Design an enzyme around this catalytic site. Sequence first.
Site, mmCIF file in Angstrom:
data_model
loop_
_atom_site.group_PDB
_atom_site.id
_atom_site.type_symbol
_atom_site.label_atom_id
_atom_site.label_comp_id
_atom_site.label_asym_id
_atom_site.label_seq_id
_atom_site.Cartn_x
_atom_site.Cartn_y
_atom_site.Cartn_z
ATOM 1 N N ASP A 74 -14.191 -16.103 7.087
ATOM 2 C CA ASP A 74 -12.811 -15.785 6.760
ATOM 3 C C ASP A 74 -12.042 -15.704 8.070
ATOM 4 O O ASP A 74 -12.140 -14.707 8.787
ATOM 5 C CB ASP A 74 -12.753 -14.455 6.005
ATOM 6 N N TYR A 126 -12.514 -6.855 5.897
ATOM 7 C CA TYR A 126 -11.377 -6.954 4.987
ATOM 8 C C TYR A 126 -11.168 -8.410 4.609
ATOM 9 O O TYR A 126 -11.188 -9.285 5.475
ATOM 10 C CB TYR A 126 -10.099 -6.381 5.605
ATOM 11 N N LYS A 183 -2.875 -16.675 7.596
ATOM 12 C CA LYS A 183 -1.714 -15.917 8.101
ATOM 13 C C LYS A 183 -0.789 -16.699 9.023
ATOM 14 O O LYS A 183 0.417 -16.716 8.808
ATOM 15 C CB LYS A 183 -2.149 -14.629 8.779
ATOM 16 N N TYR A 222 0.813 -1.216 0.000
ATOM 17 C CA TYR A 222 0.000 0.000 0.000
ATOM 18 C C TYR A 222 0.853 1.276 0.000
ATOM 19 O O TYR A 222 0.576 2.229 0.731
ATOM 20 C CB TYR A 222 -0.979 -0.043 1.181
HETATM 21 C C1 LIG Z 1 -7.259 -2.912 -2.662
HETATM 22 O O1 LIG Z 1 -8.503 -2.243 -2.447
HETATM 23 C C2 LIG Z 1 -8.360 -1.075 -1.757
HETATM 24 C C3 LIG Z 1 -8.460 0.161 -2.399
HETATM 25 C C4 LIG Z 1 -8.322 1.342 -1.664
HETATM 26 C C5 LIG Z 1 -8.088 1.287 -0.288
HETATM 27 C C6 LIG Z 1 -7.979 0.055 0.357
HETATM 28 N N1 LIG Z 1 -7.758 0.013 1.680
HETATM 29 C C7 LIG Z 1 -7.605 -1.176 2.299
HETATM 30 O O2 LIG Z 1 -7.622 -2.275 1.737
HETATM 31 C C8 LIG Z 1 -7.379 -1.084 3.810
HETATM 32 C C9 LIG Z 1 -6.959 -2.471 4.318
HETATM 33 C C10 LIG Z 1 -5.546 -2.495 4.923
HETATM 34 C C11 LIG Z 1 -4.867 -3.822 4.565
HETATM 35 C C12 LIG Z 1 -3.514 -3.939 5.280
HETATM 36 N N2 LIG Z 1 -2.704 -2.681 5.256
HETATM 37 C C13 LIG Z 1 -1.350 -2.663 5.204
HETATM 38 O O3 LIG Z 1 -0.747 -1.587 5.204
HETATM 39 C C14 LIG Z 1 -0.590 -3.771 5.131
HETATM 40 C C15 LIG Z 1 -0.747 -4.853 4.345
HETATM 41 C C16 LIG Z 1 0.234 -5.780 4.501
HETATM 42 C C17 LIG Z 1 1.181 -5.422 5.391
HETATM 43 C C18 LIG Z 1 2.274 -6.107 5.759
HETATM 44 C C19 LIG Z 1 2.412 -7.544 5.267
HETATM 45 O O4 LIG Z 1 3.152 -5.603 6.463
HETATM 46 S S1 LIG Z 1 0.795 -3.953 5.989
HETATM 47 C C20 LIG Z 1 -3.401 -1.355 5.325
HETATM 48 C C21 LIG Z 1 -4.656 -1.338 4.456
HETATM 49 C C22 LIG Z 1 -8.127 -1.116 -0.386
HETATM 50 C C1 LIG Z 2 -4.680 -10.710 5.432
HETATM 51 C C2 LIG Z 2 -6.099 -11.164 5.266
HETATM 52 C C3 LIG Z 2 -6.536 -11.664 3.949
HETATM 53 C C4 LIG Z 2 -5.581 -11.685 2.769
HETATM 54 O O1 LIG Z 2 -4.455 -12.537 2.963
HETATM 55 P P1 LIG Z 2 -3.132 -12.337 2.050
HETATM 56 O O2 LIG Z 2 -2.305 -13.545 2.405
HETATM 57 O O3 LIG Z 2 -2.586 -11.004 2.495
HETATM 58 O O4 LIG Z 2 -3.602 -12.340 0.608
HETATM 59 C C5 LIG Z 2 -7.854 -12.077 3.799
HETATM 60 N N1 LIG Z 2 -8.746 -12.046 4.811
HETATM 61 C C6 LIG Z 2 -8.455 -11.613 6.058
HETATM 62 C C7 LIG Z 2 -9.504 -11.612 7.135
HETATM 63 C C8 LIG Z 2 -7.090 -11.140 6.372
HETATM 64 O O5 LIG Z 2 -6.796 -10.695 7.624
#
Ligand SMILES: COc1cccc(NC(=O)CCC2CCN(C(=O)c3ccc(C(C)=O)s3)CC2)c1
Ligand SMILES: *Cc1c(COP(=O)(O)O)cnc(C)c1O
Lengths: 429, 429
Positions: free
Chosen positions: B247, B150, B276, B18
């Site tokens: 999930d 999510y 995870k 991100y």
């Molecule tokens: C992909 O669809 C969208 C589009 C626009 C905004 C979003 N926002 C989100 O999906 C918020 C969900 C969270 C998912 C996890 N996240 C992260 O920074 C991280 C993901 C993986 C991380 C690791 C492995 O360190 S951190 C912050 C955002 C999603």
């Molecule tokens: C992290 C997460 C996913 C996605 O898993 P990835 O291995 O990052 O693709 C899906 N569902 C839930 C509830 C999660 O916390």
Amino acid sequence: LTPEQIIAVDGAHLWHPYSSIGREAVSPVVAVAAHGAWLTLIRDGQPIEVLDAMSSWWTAIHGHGHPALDQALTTQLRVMNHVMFGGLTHEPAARLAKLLVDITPAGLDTVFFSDSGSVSVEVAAKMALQYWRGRGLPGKRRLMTWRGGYHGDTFLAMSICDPHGGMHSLWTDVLAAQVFAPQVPRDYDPAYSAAFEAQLAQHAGELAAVVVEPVVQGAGGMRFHDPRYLHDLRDICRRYEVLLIFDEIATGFGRTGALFAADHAGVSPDIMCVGKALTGGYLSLAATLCTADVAHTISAGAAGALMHGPTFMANPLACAVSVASVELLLGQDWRTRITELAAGLTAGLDTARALPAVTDVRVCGAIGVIECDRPVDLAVATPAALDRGVWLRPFRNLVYAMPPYICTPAEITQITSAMVEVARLVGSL
Amino acid sequence: LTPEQIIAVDGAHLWHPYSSIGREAVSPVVAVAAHGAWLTLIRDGQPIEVLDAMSSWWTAIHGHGHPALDQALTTQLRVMNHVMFGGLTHEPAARLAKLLVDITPAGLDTVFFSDSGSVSVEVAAKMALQYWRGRGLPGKRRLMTWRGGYHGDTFLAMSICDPHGGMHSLWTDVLAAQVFAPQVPRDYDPAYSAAFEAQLAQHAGELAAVVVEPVVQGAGGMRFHDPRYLHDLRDICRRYEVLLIFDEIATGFGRTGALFAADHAGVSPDIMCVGKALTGGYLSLAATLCTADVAHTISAGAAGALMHGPTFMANPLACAVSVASVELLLGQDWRTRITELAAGLTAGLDTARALPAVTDVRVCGAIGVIECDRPVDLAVATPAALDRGVWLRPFRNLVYAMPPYICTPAEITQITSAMVEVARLVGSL
Ligand SMILES: COc1cccc(NC(=O)CCC2CCN(C(=O)c3ccc(C(C)=O)s3)CC2)c1
Ligand SMILES: *Cc1c(COP(=O)(O)O)cnc(C)c1O
Ligand SMILES: COc1cccc(NC(=O)CCC2CCN(C(=O)c3ccc(C(C)=O)s3)CC2)c1
Ligand SMILES: *Cc1c(COP(=O)(O)O)cnc(C)c1O
């Protein structure tokens, strides 16, 4: 668990690729070891060694249990198994990114790591769509491809898979409707490209990207096409302002006789996907590369970030073995190796052309294909190959191999002989 | 590469989760080792030991470099790195499938392995869609969920992520339009479930499945809800013939204080996703489980198979380490361990409730959350936590931890102290 116990658990509880539960025509075969080009399998309760002619689905380019790759994994294991890539970085990721940027077609400067080919394709599509949104053109959101393709099993990836092959039939109303050009031919015909251009021109204002497998279409039918078609795609995409994405998940890392199949055409895509052979067949890992222009445009847009982040992004263990696998490939005369394998495949499969059920025999790098005029019975073909010391998995009307790069001339002879005999049995009945 | 060289390569070539390319407010921190609950990070040229309070994004339940898990990996490496799961089976897959069937909520009898959580969610959706198609009801193709969720980053997974949290305005015309119920409340309110049913009732004929995170919503805001809501969902789904999908990619394997979060309600879904912590944070791996009824209905349909099959499906290395991780968890008194951890988090985070910028403090199993009145500045929070010997990664307005189960009481209090101090600085600006 014993092999018998494994079979019992498997039949009750395990899904396999594109399989049923409880309706399998033949049980899977128990695999108990893998070393070099050889798998140890259980046949009639006894362990037998057979050649992995499929490279375990394109993955095992250096063979199984290569000392250098085993060593790379064990070395990393002692220091750091994994850390989150959110806010942290590490040496295996940096080393791999640097290698991949150096060896891929010119201009691919940034690397997004993910866990599988299908995910890397979804990342590629996301890059393309976010790119045009960053250019103030959110109407450019469709994808175009040619028929015969395969891009993975996630729902976006499915939308660009061959409509017959990927059966739009049972997936009508669920899949995004993308733009499909006709099957790209084997031999170069400028008229195909002109028609592709004309069709693309009509859709240019709603197209984010063209996505294709370069030179070799793998899971969709093991078809080869003239590299010049990719030269034409690059030109068409440039002139009509549509991004070009090459899916090299099957073709990458020397398999087609060039380091990447795009190199046959001397062309660079805007975005590129790699996967199957990236770790030398040890672990799941994939990457999506894009140009500086694509990366900066995404980053400067209203969004400000590429909205994707797999949990195991840039896993140190997978990255470390990948670095070792790539370095092992680059540190040898891989080009001569693949040329010798191609020659071995050609020589061994030549006799198949004369067989009654055989319509085509074709070779491209370390890939050999016998195309038949009817579906190949797996219940007949699989034991036929096993008795000859070879693991083969035909699909539809195709008997094919993509053997490990370490296969000796004697091993290639053994593989091709089994392939020719499977083809012989096809026209027997 | 030196830490400085890693930073240089990283800034030029590596995407992070991100993130942007070249527009990052903070550089990532170089990690050079991980052992037990501790990471070795480079700070101002010097290695420092810090607690992995995030468990490396929920993955490192047994900590890093656990001898049982290290040994499991190297033992499997000695015999078989990987074989293709098309036509072959193996002991790691069978051992893990047997374990997963025996420990998950009752009735989940079949296991589809994939390489990531997002893929496992796509597989769950495919199972649900193919199920109804097998019943001759292809109109049942939409998904229903509640807000705040999510489910991953692939395109179908995105369609059920919170429409505000997943900026669906940035993905307007590209995502499947799903059915969203309001945010599920913390405390049980029969009125919410009544409204959920009333809305589902309207869409029942077009709904394949309800998909939710049970008890704890992770990435969408670290929110907890009363388990009784899951009992209601199971009832509603049964009465209106809509499948229920849990999930548990974030909640699985003890994290919420039960082995699976569904266990807090005694509820069995029709389909379940895990990921995870499945491998103890060593390697990417995920699983989708479904009932015999779902499996049989898919297998008896026109397709005759679940149309999905990842390259690295059931990877022996990943499966072997997962077996060891699951056995390690089951072989100890994990429930007492998690209760002790939760007590440590509750005790240590209590003082935060009084802080001016803190709006809520909440704990569920090995999950501790300080909810603030403003978005947390990572430029302040990260260094502040590192100064206190702890790796913390806030997101949005949340300072939170999901620590390794192996953390001692002293280490937990060190984590909570750092969290409190971060929250104190949030109210300092
Ligand atoms: C992909 O669809 C969208 C589009 C626009 C905004 C979003 N926002 C989100 O999906 C918020 C969900 C969270 C998912 C996890 N996240 C992260 O920074 C991280 C993901 C993986 C991380 C690791 C492995 O360190 S951190 C912050 C955002 C999603
Ligand atoms: C992290 C997460 C996913 C996605 O898993 P990835 O291995 O990052 O693709 C899906 N569902 C839930 C509830 C999660 O916390
Ligand atoms: C996704 O929905 C559908 C429906 C109908 C057809 C298709 N696609 C296809 O038949 C072509 C895709 C092929 C992909 C590869 N394949 C496989 O059986 C295997 C996939 C992985 C294999 C391994 C790792 O051994 S085998 C056969 C099917 C997809
Ligand atoms: C196998 C393949 C994919 C999908 O990779 P998975 O790792 O199976 O998700 C995508 N594109 C191409 C060209 C492939 O050969």
